[PDB]
Amino acid sequence: KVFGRCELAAAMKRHGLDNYRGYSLGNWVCAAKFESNFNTQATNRNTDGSTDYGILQINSRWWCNDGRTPGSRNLCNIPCSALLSSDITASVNCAKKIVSDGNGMNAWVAWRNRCKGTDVQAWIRGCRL
Ligand SMILES: [Cl-]
Ligand SMILES: [Cl-]
Ligand SMILES: [Cl-]
Ligand SMILES: [Cl-]
Ligand SMILES: [Cl-]
Ligand SMILES: [Cl-]
Ligand SMILES: [Cl-]
Ligand code: NA
Ligand SMILES: [Rh+3]
Numbered sequence: 001k002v003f004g005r006c007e008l009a010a011a012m013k014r015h016g017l018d019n020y021r022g023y024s025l026g027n028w029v030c031a032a033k034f035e036s037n038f039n040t041q042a043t044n045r046n047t048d049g050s051t052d053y054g055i056l057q058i059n060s061r062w063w064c065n066d067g068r069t070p071g072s073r074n075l076c077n078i079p080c081s082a083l084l085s086s087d088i089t090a091s092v093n094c095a096k097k098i099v100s101d102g103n104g105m106n107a108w109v110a111w112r113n114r115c116k117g118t119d120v121q122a123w124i125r126g127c128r129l
Contacts, residue, residue: 001086006127026120054083
């Protein structure tokens with residue numbers, strides 16, 4: 001599923017991401033935009049052989065099981081495929097664990113490089129939230 005911007009903002013809010021670990025909703029929407037272009041089916045292979053899955057490009061190296069990432073963990077206790085669902089519950093719940101890991105949203109390189117410090121509120125402008 002390719003979410004609309006405000007559609008995703010609303011779903012993220014309902015799932016408790018607005019201000020989670022201090023990160024306003026616009027931060028989450030901005031991260032999703034640059035990670036996946038709001039596409040739940042987005043996948044991308046990393047150089048180390050791990051893969052990133054879903055709207056927030058969660059990595060098989062630590063967070064989910066895809067059966068093909070040697071030495072990796074599954075800290076969200078989910079198959080990586082669960083992160084590609086039209087229902088964002090699994091992605092959100094796993095994102096909550098990631099952002100709590102110590103480095104906040106810097107865990108998402110695209111958030112650090114493209115969202116951090118910018119006017120992220122623009123990402124939820126006009127949405128009925
Ligand atoms: Cl957009
Ligand atoms: Cl915001
Ligand atoms: Cl594996
Ligand atoms: Cl594990
Ligand atoms: Cl599994
Ligand atoms: Cl959803
Ligand atoms: Cl933080
Ligand atoms: Na894994
Ligand atoms: Rh939902």
